[PDB]
Amino acid sequence: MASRILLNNGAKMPILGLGTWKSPPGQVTEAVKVAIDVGYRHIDCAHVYQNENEVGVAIQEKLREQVVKREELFIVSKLWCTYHEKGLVKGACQKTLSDLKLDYLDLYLIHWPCGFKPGKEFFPLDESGNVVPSDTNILDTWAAMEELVDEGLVKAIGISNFNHLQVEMILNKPGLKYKPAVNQIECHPYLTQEKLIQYCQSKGIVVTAYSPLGSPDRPWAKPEDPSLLEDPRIKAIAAKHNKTTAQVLIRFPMQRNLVVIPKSVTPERIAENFKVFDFELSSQDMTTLLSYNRNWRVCALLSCTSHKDYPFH
Ligand SMILES: NC(=O)c1ccc[n+]([C@@H]2O[C@H](COP(=O)([O-])OP(=O)(O)OC[C@H]3O[C@@H](n4cnc5c(N)ncnc54)[C@H](OP(=O)(O)O)[C@@H]3O)[C@@H](O)[C@H]2O)c1
Ligand SMILES: O=C(O)COc1cc(Cl)ccc1C(=O)NCc1ccc(Br)cc1F
Ligand SMILES: [Br-]
């Protein structure tokens, strides 16, 4: 498949990007420098990841070095849940731009459908451990995102972790000005997402697959959880193709017309993960990988489950 996918804003998005959640601030600058040197042109970021300044150092250095031009990079960030207020969205976006050393983002996402009480804490809790909601809804937050396009701060806007009904809510918004370009969701062989992907793709929304390797470094991992990278069935498909299991896990979403954003801070893995354009999984391989679905989610969070807009069940 082509290396870039056309979005419904008329721009092209690289189907392979570098993830940055959990990338330590003392390692992520080098990770991003290496990624750009070996061909990555898409970086997935977020304010809540606490490392945008260090990501930005790498981007700016590579632009200064003229390794790449700004127009050839596709930089994505996300509006955190404590900034779903009319009067906070622009400043949140601007702080991300300032940190990343950019004058625009290629894509800005509503990180989660849920608004939380504004303040210093990213997860404000009540005295019993429940997240404290904001009363601001996804439609008003979307209107605020639309303003960012109209102010030139972002070239595209989208959503992340929106369920079917939430995507539909946006699409049915009275007075909708810009459709979401992307819905970024968890997707891998244990959470194959056939239903939500078909819905989004049928509406011209591009899906980005996060945690494609099963996020083995997620801080809440438990020793007994399933492991994609260690699954002997996936290893066998990889061996057949003379590729690594990670390479199969990255190529899988690409052949479903998804964008995919594996994270690494290991230079050799960053390079490995990019070497996914010179082989093909068969249809039988694809169906076989799909058959491993078990509705197993990396990203979920008990403290947020009573929020009215919590997306999962
Ligand atoms: N929108 C959202 O709500 C959301 C949620 C989750 C994730 N995301 C985005 O999606 C990105 C990817 O997801 P993720 O970080 O959860 O996990 P992931 O990409 O599925 O897995 C990352 C883990 O896999 C390891 N790894 C990477 N390449 C490997 C290879 N070739 N062989 C073996 N191990 C390898 C990494 O180790 P090393 O780094 O030590 O090499 C790290 O421990 C995130 O970083 C973030 O940008 C977004
Ligand atoms: O959300 C992400 O991108 C990855 O996960 C996290 C990253 C950081 Cl830096 C901190 C915490 C998470 C994290 O806990 N994410 C899960 C999450 C969050 C919000 C909601 Br409404 C539901 C939910 F499942
Ligand atoms: Br949420």
Q: Which domains does the chain have, with CATH numbers?
A: 1-313 (3.20.20.100)
Question: 156: which residues sit within 8 A by CB, 6+ positions away?
Answer: 7, 9, 11, 106, 107, 108, 149, 181, 182
Interior angle at CA 278, CA 275 and CA 279, nearest 5: 105
Instruction: Please report, in angstroms and rounded to a whole number, the separation of the first and last CA atoms in the chain.
Output: 34
Find residue 260's DSSP bridge partners: 16, 209
Determine which residue's CA is closest to atom 15 belonging to ligand 2. 299
Q: Are 261 and 44 in contact (CB under 8 A)?
A: yes
CA atoms within 13 Å, Cβ hemisphere of 139: 10
Pocket mutation for ligand 2, best pick of 28, 44, 112 (most atoms within 8 Å of C-beta): 112
- Which whole-number Å values give the CA distances from 138 to 33, 82, 202, 256, in the listed order? 35, 13, 21, 28
Query: Is there an atom of ligand 1 within 6 Å of 269 CB?
Result: yes
48 C-beta closer than 6 A to ligand 2:
yes
Atom of ligand 2 nearest to the CA of 307: 21
| Elucidation method | X-ray
Question: Which ligand has the nearest atom to the CA of 75?
Answer: 1
244 assigned ligand-binding residue = yes
Residues 6+ apart with CB under 8 A from 75: 42, 43, 45, 59, 100, 102, 105, 106, 107
Phi, psi of 215 (to 5 degrees): 45, 60
Contacts of 296 (CB under 8 A, 6+ apart): 190, 191, 225, 226
249 close to 285: Cβ distance less than 8 angstroms: no
Ligand 1 contact, 299 CB (< 6 A): yes
SS3 267: helix
- Please check if 236 is assigned to a binding site: yes
Query: Atom of ligand 2 at shortest distance to CA of 309?
Result: 21
CA dist., res. 152 & res. 106, Å (int): 10
Give the residues across from 191 on adjacent strands.
Answer: 188
Pocket test of ligand 2: the residue of 134, 299, 307, 308 to mutate, having most ligand atoms within 8 Å of its CB, is 299
Best probe residue, ligand 1, of 161, 247, 264 (max atoms within 8 Å of C-beta): 264
Residue nearest to atom 19 of ligand 2 (CA): 112
- The stretches of the chain forming alpha helices (DSSP H) are 25-38, 52-65, 86-100, 138-150, 164-171, 194-202, 232-240, 245-255, 267-274, 283-290
For residue 21, which atom of ligand 1 is closest to its CA? 45
Q: Which of 221, 212, 166 is nearest to 192 (CA)?
A: 212
Q: What angle do CA 114, 115, 117 make, to 5 degrees?
A: 140
Q: Which of 48, 112, 102, 114 is nearest to 75 (CA)?
A: 102
Largest CA distance in the chain: 54
Q: Is the dihedral of CA 15, 255, 280, 245 positive or negative?
A: positive
Decide if 101 contacts 58 (C-beta within 8 A): no
